[PDB]
Amino acid sequence: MRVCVIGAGLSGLAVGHALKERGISFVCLEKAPDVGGIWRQPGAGERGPGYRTLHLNTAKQLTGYADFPMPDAYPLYPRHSQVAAYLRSFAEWAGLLDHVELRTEVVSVRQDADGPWTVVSRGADGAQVSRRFEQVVVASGHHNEPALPDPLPAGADSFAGTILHSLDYRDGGDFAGRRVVVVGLGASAVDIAADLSRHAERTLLSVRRGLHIVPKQLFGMSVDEIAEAPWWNEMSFDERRRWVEQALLVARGRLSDYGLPEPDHPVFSSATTLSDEILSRIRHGAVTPKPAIASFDGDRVVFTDGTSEPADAVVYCTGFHMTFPFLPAGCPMSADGSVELYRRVVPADRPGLYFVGLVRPVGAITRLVEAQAEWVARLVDGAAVLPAADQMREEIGTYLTGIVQRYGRTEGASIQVDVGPYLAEF
Template sequence: MRRTCVIGAGPSGLAASRVLASRGIPFDCFEAGSGIGGLWRYDNDNGMSGVYASLHANISKESMSFSSLPMPDSYPVFPHHTQVLAYLESYAETFGLHGHIALRAEVTSVRPVEGGGWEVTRRSRGAAEAVTDRYTEVVVANGHHWDPRLPDPAVPGAGVFEGSAVHAHAYRSPGPYAGQRVLVVGMGNSGCEIAAEISRSAARTFLSARTVAHVFPKMLLGRPADHWAVSRAAALPRFLKNPAMALLLRLARGTPALYGLPEPVRRPLAAHPSTSDELLVQLARGAVTAKPGIRSFGRDSASFTDGSREAVDAVVYATGYSLSFPFLDPAVFAAPDGRTELYLRTVPPRLPGLFFMGLAQPAGAAFPLLEPQAEWIADLIEGEVLLPTPAEMTRSIARARERHDKVYAPTYRHGIEIDIRAYRRALRRELRAGRRRALRAAARRPDAPRPAAVSDAV
C-alpha cells in the first residue's frame, strides 16, 4: 500500500500536507517540535527557530500568502512573527491537517530500501524506543534556516576573544547588549535588522561585511518592495532590470555614501536582497558604523581589513545557515556547497520516491511556490505525470547551474536562489511534458487509466 512521509510541519511541510490531503493520498507528517509553524514558532522547542522577539516579516502579507488561503485583511502589510504563526495554524485548521501531523516526533533516519521505498525511523519525545516504518515516498520539508553557519575557517583570534559571541540564530532581544560595544557580522536581512535594533541601546554598534549588500527599503515607490519581483517590470531582460533597479534604489534612498557605505560591487539582482528601513536610519544617525571584513580578533577588540581596530564586547554572527539533512546519510544526499543536485529544486534524479520542498529561494517569499511544488509532487505520486530519465534530469540540472552562475553571486548563500518567474515557467513546462510522457506510457498499456488534465496555474 502506498503511503507518503512528510518531514517537518513548517510552511513547506504544511503545504505538502494540504495538497496530499486534498488528493486523498495517504501520508504521515512528523514534526520534531511541540507545535506546527517551523521557524515561525518563537523559541520552538525543536531548537530550529531563529525568530527574535521583535521580528516582522520583511515581505508583504500578499506575497507570503498561500493561494488557497490569503492572510487576513486585518494584518499589517508586514506581519509580526506571531501573526505569521497564527496564519499557519489557521491554515492547518482550515484544511484539517492536525490529524495527519505527529508532534514531538523527530525523524532520525531515512534509508532507501532495496526494491523501492524508504525506511523512516522516528523517535517520539518520551518514548523508550524509536519506531521504523516503510513508506513509498518521502517529502523532505525540514527547512533551510535552522543550522547556523559560522565563518569557516574561523576568523584568526576568534578563540582568544573574551567577549560573548553568538550566531544570530540565538539572538532574541537587544537587552543583553545594552551599553556594550557590539559587532554584527554579515549584511543579510538578519544582520541588518539586528544591528539596527541593538544600536538603539548599545554603546556602539558596528556592522561588518566583506561584501557590501544593496539595502532595499521595505516600500519602494509606494508599494512593498517585494511586489516588484512579480510585477510586469520583472519581465524585463536582466540586462535592463539591474540598471533599472539600481536607479530605483538611488531615487528611493540616495547613494550608499550617505550612510557611510561603499558602493556595492555586485549588481542589485545578483544577490538575495537585504531589506531594512531601520538600518538605513541608524546608519544615517551614526548609531551603526559600517566596517569591512574582519582581519582578526584580540581579547577585547576586532581588527578590520582597512587597517582599523575597534574595541568590542560582543559579537553576533549573522552569517547564514547550512543546508542540512541529518536524517539522510551524506552518501545518499547532501549539499556541502550550498547547492542541491535536484531537478527543478525538487527531485534527486537517481533516488525514486524522494522529494524536497522549499529549497527554491526567490527574492521575495517562497510561500507562493510551495503549493504548486507540492501539486507536482502529488501528480508524480499518482502517476498523472512522469519524470524525464535520470540522465536527462542530470543534464538539466547542469544546464540550470550554468545559467544560475551567470546571474547570481558565487557564494554558499546563493546556491538555491531562483528567479520566481523563470521557476514558475519551468514548472509549467515540466507539468505539460510530464503529462505527455504519462500519456505515451499509458498508450503502451491500453488498460491503464489516462492522466487527468494539467493546470497551468503555477
C-alpha cells in the same frame, strides 16, 4: 503509510494539504512542539534563525497561502508572532494536525530494495521508532545549521566576551547597555544591528563586502509587487537595472555616503539586502559602520582598518548551511557547489523521494512550494510521471551549466530560480 513528510513548516503544511486534497495517507513528523517552522521560534524563546523583531520582507497577499488569505487586519509585513499564528490556524482549517506528530524527529531515512523507505523517528522520551513508508517527502528547509567564518579570527579563544550566531540571538534587550559587533550585511545582520541600537550602549556593524541595501518599498509598492507589475515585466533588463539605480539613488543616494563599501557588482548581480532602518541608524549614530574583524585583543575586537573597540559580545550574522542529517546517502549534491534535483525537487536516482522548498526565488517562496506540493501529489498516486533517469539528468545539467551565466559559481546558486517562468510550468 503512503507518504512520510519530514517537516511541518510552511513547506510541509503545504504538501500535507495537497495530499489530503487527493486523499493520500500521510504524516508530517515535526521535531518542534508545534507547527510553523522557523516562524514559531521567536515567541517560543527557542534557538532559531529568527528573532523577536523579525518581520516579513514579502507582501502578505503575495506570501499567504493562495487558498487561505492572511487576516485582513494584518499589515503588509506581519511580525513573526502574526505569521506563526496564521500558519497554525491554517493547519486547523485543513485538518492536518491529526496527521502531524509533533515533538518527533526523524533521525535517519534509508531506501529499501523493494521501494518503500524505512524511517526511524525520535520522540520526546529519547526513544526511537523505525517505520516503513511508501514514499517520503523532504520538507525540512535549508536555514537549519549556522554558517561561521571559515577560521575564527585570532584570539577568539581568549575573548573574555561572548561570541554568537544569529540563531542564538533573541531580543537585544539581553544586550542592554553592552557593546556588540554585528558581523554581516544580510537580512539577519541589518535587522539585528538595528534591534541593538535601541538596547545596546554602542552597536557596530562589521562588513567584508558591499551589498546593495534597498528599501522594502519603492513608489509605495514593495519590491515584490513590482516584480509582478505588468510595467516592470514589460521592460527589459537594462531598463530595470537603471530603473532601480535611479530610484535607489533618489531614495537613499549613494551607499558610500553611509560608510558602506560600494558593491563590486551592480544591482541584480550583488545580493540585495532589504532594510527600511539601517541607513537611518547610521545617520543617527545608533549603529557604526566597520570593516572586517581582525583579532580579539582582550575585551576588545580589532578591525582591519586598525581600530580597536571594547566589545562585550559579537553576534555573527554569517548565514546558514544546508544540511539534511537524516539522509546518510548525501543531500542531492553535484560537488561543484550544486544540487541534483530534476526541476528542483526530484532526485533522478531515487524513486519516491521528493524535496519541497529547496528553492530560492526573488520574493516569497509560498507559490513555489504550493506548486511543488500539487505536482508531488500527482507524482505519488500516479496522475503524473517523470522522464527516464538520463532525461532527468539533462534538465538538471541545463539548470546547472546555466546558473553560471545568469549568476556564477558561489554558494547555493543551485537552488535559485525566477518566480514567473518556473511557476509557468504548472
